[PDB]
């Protein structure tokens, strides 16, 4: 045949494609959708905690 593994990359699943941070975007934003005093500084606090 003529095919050296060069016809498969349509983002099928990759074993663990989904379930990679979703429910967070489907809730967090639901609250940070329309605040008011949006952050202008951005990253002004500590690097962690």
- DSSP assignments along 1-47, one per residue: ---SS-S--S----SS-S-SS-TTTTTHHHHHSS-SS--SS-S-S-S
The pair of structure tokens assigned to 24 is: 């967070």
Rounded CA-CA distance 30/45 in Å is 24
Say if CB 17 and CB 11 are below 8 A apart. Answer: yes
Q: How was this structure determined?
A: NMR
The CA distances from residue 43 to 17, 35, 40, 46, 47, in Å, are: 29, 18, 9, 8, 8
Residues 6 or more apart whose Cβ sits within 8 Å of residue 11? 17
HSE-CB for 3 with a 13 A CA cutoff:
5
Number of domains in the chain: 1
User: How far apart are the C-alpha atoms of 44 and 7, rounded to whole Å?
Assistant: 47
Q: Domain with 35 in it: what CATH number?
A: 4.10.92.10
Q: 17 lies in which domain range?
A: 1-49
């Amino acid at each position: 045949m003529v095919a050296a593994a060069m016809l498969l990359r349509s983002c099928p699943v990759l074993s663990q494609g989904p379930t990679g941070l979703l429910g967070k975007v489907a809730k967090t934003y639901q609250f940070l959708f329309s605040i008011g005093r949006c952050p202008i500084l951005a990253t002004q606090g500590p690097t962690c905690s």
